[PDB]
C-alpha cells in the first residue's frame, strides 16, 4: 500500500534530496524572537477583530463553505481569485500608497505582514540564487519576480470545531486541505508559508504537517513535513506545479501566512478601471444622463463594449458583493472603487440598451442588423446564464445560514418594477427575440 516519510524515517532525507530538492524548511531558529512575537501577535489582533471568513467558493457546481477561515492581504487594488471566488486585498502599507487604513490595531497586522512579506522575498531570493548555484555546479531579474510577492493569504483553522477527511494516498491521517497545486500564480513563482502552531508508525497526530507528492503519483512515498511555531517553508521554482501539497491537521489550532506572486494581469483595480474607459470611449461623453449615444455600431466595438460589460460585472461587482460587508469589517479601501465601478456598470447598462436600441432602428439594413446580432448574442446569453447562477448562488440554503455581516448579496438587483434601470434583470426575453431575429432571416 501507500507510505509516507517523516524525520523519524532513515530515508526521508535522501528522499528530500531526490524527489522534493525544491523544496526549502526554515525553523523557527532562522527567525528572530522578535519579528516572531509580531506576527503571532498580528494573527491574534485579526483573530480577535474578525478579520477571517470562511469562503461560500463553488467547486465542480457544488456550493462549499471552506472549513478554513481566511483573509486576503497585499498591495493595493490588487486580487487573487481562488477557488473562482476574486478575494480583495485587505491593502498593507506599501510604499508612496499611504491608505486611509481600517480600525488602528487592524492596520498594525498589515504592517506587520508586509514586515513579514519584505523578509520572506529575502529568504527566498537567496535560496533561488543557491537553487541555481547548485544547477550551475552540475537571469537575475527572473528571481526577482518570482519572488516579488504582492499578496498574503492567511488562514486559521481550529480542528476542535469541526467534526475531517481523512488523507486518501498514504495514511498521512487528517487533513485540513486536500491534495492540490496553488493555481494563479505568476509562472515558477516562488510560494512562502509562515506557520503558527498553537501551543508510532507514522507521522504524529497532534502536530500540524504540510504533505508533498509527486503529480499523478501516489506510489513513490509522500513527505510529511512538522510544523511547529514559527517554522517556515519555501515552493521554489517549478514544485507548485511538479508536485501538490495538502495541510495535515493537529490537535490545535494553527495560523498560516502564505505569501503568493499573484497573476494579476486581469485582477487589478487600475486594469479593470482602464477596461470600464475603454468601453464608454464608445458613449458621447459630455454629460452623464440617460440618453446614452454611441459614437460606432460597428460589430467588433460593440462585441467588445458589451463584453467589458460582462466582465465588471461579474468578476467585479458580482463577486465582491457575493462576500457581502465582509470587507467594511476590515478596511474602507474598496467602498469608492466599487461604487465607481458600478457606476460605470450602470452606463454600459444604458449602452446595450442603445444597442438594443439600433437594432430596432427602421432604417436600419437586415445586412447590418444581422452583424449586429452575431456580435453581441454570445455576450448577452452569458449576462443572462451567469445572473442566473449568482443570484440561485445567493439564495443557496449553505448560504442563507451565514451570519448576517457575511450574508451574500446579489449585488446589483432591481426588480422589474423598478424605473431607475433601462433594462430588467431577466434578459431571456431579450435573448429569445434576439435569437429568432437571426432565425427570421
Ligand atoms: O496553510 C498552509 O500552510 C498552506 N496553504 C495552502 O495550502 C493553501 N493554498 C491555497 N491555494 C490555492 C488553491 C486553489 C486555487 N484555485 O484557483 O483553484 C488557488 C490557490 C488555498 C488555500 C490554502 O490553505
Ligand atoms: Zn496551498
Redesign the pocket.
Known amino acids: 500500500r501507500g507510505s509516507h516519510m517523516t524525520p523519524k524515517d532513515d530515508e526521508f532525507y535522501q528522499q528530500w534530496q531526490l524527489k522534493y530538492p525544491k523544496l526549502i524548511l526554515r525553523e523557527a531558529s532562522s527567525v528572530s524572537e522578535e519579528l516572531h512575537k509580531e506576527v503571532q501577535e498580528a494573527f491574534l489582533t485579526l483573530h480577535k477583530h474578525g478579520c477571517l471568513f470562511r469562503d461560500l467558493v463553488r467547486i465542480q457546481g457544488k456550493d462549499l463553505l471552506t472549513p478554513?477561515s481566511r483573509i486576503l492581504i497585499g498591495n493595493p487594488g490588487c486580487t487573487y481569485?481562488?477557488?473562482n471566488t476574486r478575494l480583495f486585498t485587505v491593502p498593507w502599507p506599501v510604499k508612496g500608497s499611504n491608505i486611509k487604513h481600517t480600525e488602528a490595531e487592524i492596520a498594525a497586522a498589515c504592517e506587520t505582514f508586509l514586515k513579514l512579506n519584505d523578509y520572506l522575498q529575502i529568504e527566498t531570493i537567496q535560496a533561488l540564487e543557491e537553487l541555481a548555484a547548485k544547477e550551475k555546479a552540475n537571469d537575475e531579474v527572473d528571481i526577482k519576480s518570482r519572488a516579488a510577492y504582492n499578496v498574503t493569504?492567511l488562514?486559521f483553522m481550529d480542528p476542535q470545531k469541526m467534526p475531517l477527511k481523512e488523507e486518501p494516498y498514504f495514511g498521512m491521517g487528517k487533513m485540513a486541505?486536500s491534495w492540490?497545486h496553488?493555481?494563479?500564480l505568476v509562472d515558477r513563482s516562488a510560494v512562502a508559508?509562515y506557520?503558527y502552531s498553537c501551543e508510532l508508525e507514522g507521522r504524529d497526530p497532534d502536530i500540524w504537517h504540510?504533505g508533498f507528492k509527486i503529480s499523478w503519483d501516489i506510489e513513490t512515498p509522500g513527505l510529511a513535513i512538522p510544523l511547529h511555531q514559527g517554522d517556515c517553508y519555501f515552493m521554489l521554482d517549478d514544485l507548485n506545479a511538479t508536485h501538490q501539497?495538502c495541510?495535515l491537521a493537529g490537535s490545535q489550532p494553527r495560523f498560516?501566512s502564505?505569501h503568493r506572486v499573484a497573476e494579476c494581469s486581469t485582477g487589478t483595480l487600475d486594469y479593470i478601471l482602464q477596461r470600464c474607459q475603454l468601453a464608454l470611449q464608445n458613449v458621447c461623453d459630455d454629460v452623464d444622463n440617460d440618453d446614452v449615444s454611441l459614437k460606432s455600431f460597428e460589430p467588433a466595438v460593440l462585441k467588445q463594449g458589451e463584453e467589458i460589460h460582462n466582465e465588471v460585472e461579474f468578476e467585479w461587482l458580482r463577486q465582491f458583493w457575493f462576500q457581502g460587508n465582509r470587507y467594511r469589517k476590515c478596511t474602507d479601501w474598496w467602498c469608492q472603487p466599487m461604487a465607481q465601478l458600478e457606476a460605470l456598470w450602470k452606463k454600459m447598462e444604458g449602452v446595450t440598451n442603445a444597442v438594443l436600441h439600433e437594432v430596432k432602428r427602421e432604417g436600419l439594413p437586415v445586412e447590418q442588423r444581422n452583424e449586429i446580432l452575431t456580435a453581441i448574442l454570445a455576450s448577452l446569453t452569458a449576462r443572462q446564464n451567469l445572473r442566473r447562477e449568482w443570484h440561485a448562488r445567493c439564495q443557496s440554503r449553505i448560504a442563507r445560514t451565514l451570519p448576517a455581516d457575511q450574508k451574500p448579496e446579489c449585488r446589483p438587483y432591481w426588480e422589474k418594477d423598478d424605473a431607475s434601470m433601462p433594462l430588467p434583470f431577466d434578459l431571456t426575453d431579450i435573448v429569445s427575440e434576439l435569437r429568432g431575429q437571426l432565425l427570421e432571416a
Open positions: 478554513v481569485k481562488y477557488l493569504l488562514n486541505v492540490h496553488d493555481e494563479n508559508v506557520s504540510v501539497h495541510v498560516s502564505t
